[PDB]
Every structure is written in C-alpha cells, then in structure tokens.
Write a protein that binds this DNA or RNA. Sequence first.
RNA 1: UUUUUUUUUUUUUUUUUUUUUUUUUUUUUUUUUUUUUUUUUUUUU
Lengths: 122, 419, 419, 53
Amino acid sequence: QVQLVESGGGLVQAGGSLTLSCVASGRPFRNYRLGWFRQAPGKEREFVAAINWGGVITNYADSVKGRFTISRDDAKNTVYLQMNSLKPEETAVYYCAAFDSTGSPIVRDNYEYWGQGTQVTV
Amino acid sequence: SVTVKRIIDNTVIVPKLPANEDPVEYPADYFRKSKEIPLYINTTKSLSDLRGYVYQGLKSGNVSIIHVNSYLYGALKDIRGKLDKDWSSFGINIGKAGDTIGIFDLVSLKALDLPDGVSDASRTSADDKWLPLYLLGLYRVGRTQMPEYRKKLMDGLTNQCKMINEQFEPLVPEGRDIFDVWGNDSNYTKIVAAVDMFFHMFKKHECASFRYGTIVSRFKDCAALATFGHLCKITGMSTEDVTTWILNREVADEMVQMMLPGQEIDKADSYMPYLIDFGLSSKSPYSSVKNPAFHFWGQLTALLLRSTRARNARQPDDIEYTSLTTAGLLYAYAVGSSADLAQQFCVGDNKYTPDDSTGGLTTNAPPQGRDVVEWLGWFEDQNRKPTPDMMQYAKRAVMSLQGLREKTIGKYAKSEFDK
Amino acid sequence: SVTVKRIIDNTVIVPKLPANEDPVEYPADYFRKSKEIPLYINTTKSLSDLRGYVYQGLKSGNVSIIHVNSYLYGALKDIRGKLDKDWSSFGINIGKAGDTIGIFDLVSLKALDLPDGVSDASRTSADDKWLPLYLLGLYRVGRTQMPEYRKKLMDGLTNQCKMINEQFEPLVPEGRDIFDVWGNDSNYTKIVAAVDMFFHMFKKHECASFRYGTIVSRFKDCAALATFGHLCKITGMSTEDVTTWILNREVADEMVQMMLPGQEIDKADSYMPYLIDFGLSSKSPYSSVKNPAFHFWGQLTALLLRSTRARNARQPDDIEYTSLTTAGLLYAYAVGSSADLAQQFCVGDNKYTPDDSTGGLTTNAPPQGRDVVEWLGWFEDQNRKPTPDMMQYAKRAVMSLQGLREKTIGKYAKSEFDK
Amino acid sequence: GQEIDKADSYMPYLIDFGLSSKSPYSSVKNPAFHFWGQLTALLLRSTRARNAR
RNA sequence: UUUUUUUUUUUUUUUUUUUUUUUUUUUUUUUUUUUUUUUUUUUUU
C-alpha cells in the first residue's frame, strides 16, 4: 500500500502563481505513476498533469499547458507542480494520484491510489 | 623493456607488438557512480492489450521487444516474497525488516520514451501464467546456435505444458531467429537478471519454475571462477591450498585479477552473478577470455583427476600450453598419488598408530602430503622433467576417453598423453 | 581460512568461492512445530459425480487434480485395517488399542477453498474399484521421461486388467503429459504417501495391489541410505564395522549427516520414508545429491564386490573421484581377499584346529581379517599406492561387464581398471 | 617511427588508407620470419599454426 | 621448330575472427531405463 498527502494549496490572487506538493508514504521503492487531478464545484474529476516514474515523460491537459509544470524527487518521494498564471476557472480541489507501473495515464481509472485532496481557490 | 642489439653491426632494435586494451570492469566500480540500476520500460498500454500484442506478435514473425518488456512488467509486477532476513548488496538495502519484496524492487523503474503493433482478444488471464515463462525461456534458447542443443525449446514447451496441458509453441520454425535479438535489448536482460536474482532468494515460490531460461544469466561470462570452484572440489583441497599450487605467472596474474576483495563474489545472494545482463560491467573479469591460462590449467588438472565436465571444456587460444600442461601434470600427479587416507571413526578407542622405526632410508620417493614446497623439490630431483610414472599416470587418465569434441581439453589431453 | 600471500610482492590474496546454502531439512524438525500434517481436499461434490468427472476428464486431455484428489478421498475413504499392535510416529499416536485404522487417519482432513468440470453417468461402483489404482499408478508412471521405462503404464494397465478383464487405459497417448503435473499437487502426494504408508502396515489387504504406483514414494530422494544398506549387505559386515571403513572426510561428514539420532530411520513403519511427499522436508538429508561421495564410494565398492545394482548407479558431479576410488579399492580388496571362511557345523564334535607352529615368518602378507586398523598399516607398507594385485583384482571385477550406460559407475569402474 | 605500438593509430590501416602500396609487415616481405615463428609456435602446441601457409 | 614447375605475380598469403562469449552444463528437481503381492531353472512327473 501507499499513502499520498497533498500540500501547498490555499487561496491566491487572480493571476498569481502557486505550487502544490504531494508526499508519498508506505512503499516508495516501487514502480508508481504520479498524476494530478482536480474537481470543480459541480464538475466531474478531470485530468490536470502526470509524470512517469523515471521523471522524463510528462503530459498536461489542454486547459493548463504552458502554465503548469510537474516534477518529482523520488529520493524524497514527492512530486511538485507549479501553477503559474492562475485563473478562477482553476478553482477546484486538487488530488494527487498514483498508479503502479512505468507510465502516466490521462484518465482517472488508470490510477490506484488517491490523496484526500487540497482546495485551491482563485 | 630492455635494450636489444643486433650483434652483426651493433644496430639497436626495438621489438614491439600491436597493443589491445580490452580493459576489465568490476561490478563494485559501477555502484560508486550510480547507487541504483534503471529499467527502461513503457507503462502506457494495458496488460490485456499487451497479451494480444505479444501473442499475435509471437504467432507471426513480427514482435516488438518493447512490448514484451512492457508486458513482462505488468505480467510479473504482482509477484512477491517475504524476507526471513535482511537483503543488501553493494550499498543497496533492497529489503527492510519483514516487509515483502517484489521482483522489481531490485531495479528502479524509468519510462521508455511507440511501436504500433497489433492487438488480439479472447486472450484471458490464463495466458499471463505461462507467457512470461515462455518469453523468459526463449532468452536461454536463443543463445546457442547448435541445432540440437537449441532444442531446449522442447523443455520450455514441456515446462509450460506442465502449467497448461494444451500449450504448443506460438512461434514459427523461422522463430529460431526471432528471439535471438531479444538478448540485445538491455532492459530485457535487466528483466531476466532480476527474475533469476529474485527467485534465487525465494527458492520454493510457486512461480520458481520461471527461473528456467533465466538460470543462464547467473554467472554469465564467469566461467573461470566456476573452474576454480570445480578444481577446489575435484582436488578436495581448500581454496588457499589450491591457490598455492599455481606455478605459472599468467595464472598468478589472472588469479589476482579474479580475487579483488570488494566484488561480493562470496555473498550468497548478490548483484555480482548478474553483472553482465544488469549492465554492471561490459567486460567481465571472471570470464575464460580474460583468464585463459587459469581455465586451461584448472580444467586440465581436473580432467587428469577423473573429471567429467572437463571432457568438453574448450581449449583457449594463445597461451603457453607446454608450461601450463606440465604444471597441471605435477599438480594432478601430486593429488593422484597422495590419497591421504586417514582413519576417521574408531570402535574400542584404537586408532592407526604409524610406525617410526622404519629407518632403511626409503629416499628418492615422492612426498607424502600435497605441499607445494615438497613437490617442487622432488620435481627438482627429477630435473624438472616429468617422470615416466607421471606420463604413464596421465596416459591412464586420458585413455579410454571416447566421443571427444574438437578444440576441447579432453581431446587435447588425450592427444597429448595417450601414445 | 588461513592467510595466503603472493611471494613476488608480498601482496595478500583472499581466495573465495561463490556460496550456495542448500540447507537440509530433517523430518523430526517438522513435528516440533506442527503435531499433524493436513490434507487439503474438497468435500462438496458427491462420489458418483466425481467418478464421471475424472473418467470423462481422463478420456480427454482436461482433468482437475482437485477432482482426482476429492475423488480419491471418498473412493478410498471406507478402507480399513485392524492393528495387531500400537502405531505411533514422531509423537503422533495414529492407532489406539485394537481399534481399526483407516487410510486417512494418518493425516488430518482440511477443506480446500471450484473447478467446473464435466459429468458422466452409466459409471457404476465397478469403476471405484480400479480408478484409484489407475490414478495412483500414473504417479509412478509420470516420474520418468524415458520412453520405454515409462511403459510401466502397461503394468498398471495389466494390474487393473486383473481387477476387470476389459480394462483399457482411459488416456490418450498425449496423456504422457497429463499425469506428469499431478506430482506437483501437494495434496495428491500427501494421498499417495498415506496410501503407501497404510498398505505397508496392512500388508495382505485385499486392496494391497493399490501400493503399485505408490511404492516409489517410500524413501523417495533417499538413495544414499539405500546405498548404505546395499553396502552393509554386499560386504556382509555390520553397520558399525562398515562405518569404520570410511577413509574420506566428505564421506565422514555425510555419514554423520544421515545418522542424526532422532529421525526414526530405523523404525519399521514410520513417517520418515515419506518425508518428501508428505511435505515433512523440502530438501531430503538422505539423497545422493546431499551425500554424493557416500553414494559414489559405497556404490563403487559394492560394484567391485560383485554387485549388480551398482552396474547402473549414476556417477555424481564435483567429488574427489581419485581419493574415493582408492578408498573403495582398498575396502573392496580387503573384503575380497578376506573371505573369512569358518566352520559352522560339526559331526563328531571335531572342529578345525588352527596350527600355531608356523614360525617361518610369513610376513609382507595382507592382514587376516577385515580390521581397518591393520589394512591401513599394510597399505602404509605399500607406500599408500595400490599394489598390482589390487589393480589386477579390480580389473578382474570390472572386466566382462557389458551393456554399460554412460555416466554410470559401472562404465566408470570399467574405464578405470580395465586396461 | 611507425607507431606499431600505439593502441589507436593510422598504422594498422596503411593499405586501405593508401599510406603504403607494399606493406613492410607482410608474410611476403618477411617469409622466413613467418615460417620460423609459425613453425616454432606449432611445435609449442599452437592451434593457429596448424593452417598457416 | 618447340618448350620442357598440369608455377605465376597486382597487393596478399590460419577453408582466422574479435561484439561479448564459450562443458552440443544446467540441478526447482531427482537421479539402479529397480521395486515388492507372493515369488524368483523361458523345470517337470
């Protein structure tokens, strides 16, 4: 098993930057995909960004390309994700997810582990 | 390098030969740079997609090694074992406490950065059982170009027939060329090495049969070391005693080369036996290519001491066959004459009491033990020429050998002493 | 472990070899944890359902081992015997007083926690008679990969033809691969071992024929012990006398390994002979794989003493063939020369009276009995080299041997002394 | 001065590079050396010399 | 009339390849192509 803790959320000014982090506990010494998701008020959980295990392959949703950046330090077993140029459409609860393999899916049914999530209001 | 002159006109000559580096890479010199070995793999497609990918790809001549790696991952990802004791190797603590360790805890997972392929349905999870066993077995099958020894595919076919009665090889006869390329993908070798290394620790796992096909990865390109074990077993002498019976300078340099002190060659479960497929080393230090005189010397001495494995051991090129053979003759003759029979168990607390009142001076007789210091002296009393009893002994050992292959030390010894 | 240095530059070297644990598990070390062995079985479906399950499953290539276990249970459940005396083994009192004991009193019944299968009718209770005999016989048939020795299926077919004249094997020729997997189900082996253990006590049962096929479970992976019995029989010497004629250190360690004092190796009816199929031990201590030098030494000595079984005994790998062979030569020569003929019955109370007035000093002659303390001394008087009468004796023993298999100690001895 | 001892040099390819039209190290310009050394090797249990011309 | 290597040139000259290997070794096993129910002349009165 693996536990994920999201950290770094809050409110920010319309147009401001922010960087969420997700800390993994349990078994970090094994293949596990890392992706960020979000869910807006009355909106189904959608994909935001993902990163493979090695830390070379990544992908972003169209709504956030250019702005957001994803990264991971598996030594400290975490995964940061810069969120520059925020917008009130960016307001949602952001979840950190893991699915054990060697890649990063674009769906929410590909993951196996989920954090509790942090609120982000803009 | 010493000055050489031509005596007819005092002209100085510089005898020089072409040089070949061919350096040697030890495993522990890899881990002081990187504290982990990566496995490049693609985790995009799903398991049941890869099953038809490699099944329909196997049935035809086309298959992507990326797909059999990516399929072998998820096909072997949920296999585990509970460690009785800790497991660490070259500064890598793979297992901590009582926590279970999987088959890919040994390596680190990275992402490969695609083959279009072709899919198939109706392929259930009953093929996830043996398709890894198959793909692993073809690594061992596809390393030998002999027509009948490559018929280990019948034993992979059999070992999978044990898993499912109606298993028949999903590969065309031309397939004898299909899995020969798999051994060139670094990640596939990093898979088979992790499978064998895992199943060596967890020995009685229900999936231990998977080790078939990966067992050829253990101590691959490490023959000379196995000849040192075979000699230390056939002679019955300790490693330190056998080490003294090295009388050739080349075998001395090679024996110093193999026994560098920080390569975990004595650990039971270590990364060392898989230094080639893991990529810890590109030129093994324990091969019979970098230790030729040791392979020839130890194998020949074993053969003279009634060995069976040595009858087919291959004779290396460009070594001192004469000096090496004489050394093996004195060694094998010493071990042969000195059986060193000694009483082990007694009944009425009566042991053999040797008689010291034998003073007729039975000199000019070979030594009584297996000490090198005495056999070199006796050999000096023989003018450093093998006595007719030594040559006759070797003839007795090599005669009645039949079915000998060419370029083997069995046919060499037979052709040398049997006349 | 003693310090070794290279004399050219005083450099210290540490000769070390790869290590392999391969520990040894004794049977009595299993019963101090669990005081009973379980048999995992499924008791859901009925007997007459399982009869068609395994009959129609046998006729085809598909059959569930769970169904042949669950069928063998109820098919053998109502078989019994009356104990003349008590029966206990490893702290398990299986039989109490005069009460009858069944075939599954030996193990404890647990529930297996399913195969869909397929059923059949018209199969009466006349197939419950021999279907257990069949399924048990295929365990013995399916353990040998030789094409003509696997034709023990003709003797199972015959032994069931004795039960019912019109019995013909309900298995396809491809079936040569069907029952080869049955030996991997722990509960099936726990069935055959209980059948053989039961029918060893109740010897003249009307269903004792069932022991055919299960007899290969008794002392399975326990060859070296049987070579100790074969040597103690061929030599004609006691176990303690033969134990003294061990002159090799390896055979000493192995002989100490087999003779641990709490494993019931001397009890007539015990759990020890079935320590492998019962799961009491995963690595037998009495195998010719953990006792190689004992197997080679005892088998070779027997062969030199006119043995027939040894003509086909296999030659292990990585042992001291030279020292072991010399030991077997001195032992077999001692037993061969010292027939020790002595008068046993007399008529007019006249016995052979040896003459002690022989004082011409007939020295330099071999000892008169079979004492090791004297033959080691005589052998020392022979400079620890086999005399030409010993080598000639061995040549006399191994010559005229024909039809010898490769890798056997018969062809080894013939190739060693017959020249 | 021909770099016959250097590990990586232009010398081993003096023929295809056109550095030399008649090699100095051939068994055509050094016949007695080829015969002598090859025969001595063969007498010292060589395998390559069994087919040397 | 000849000519008198069933010699021939242009370098060359392992029916040598270096990519690493190298028991037509894999052993998880387990190793009488032994087996038990008596029996044990392909003996008969």
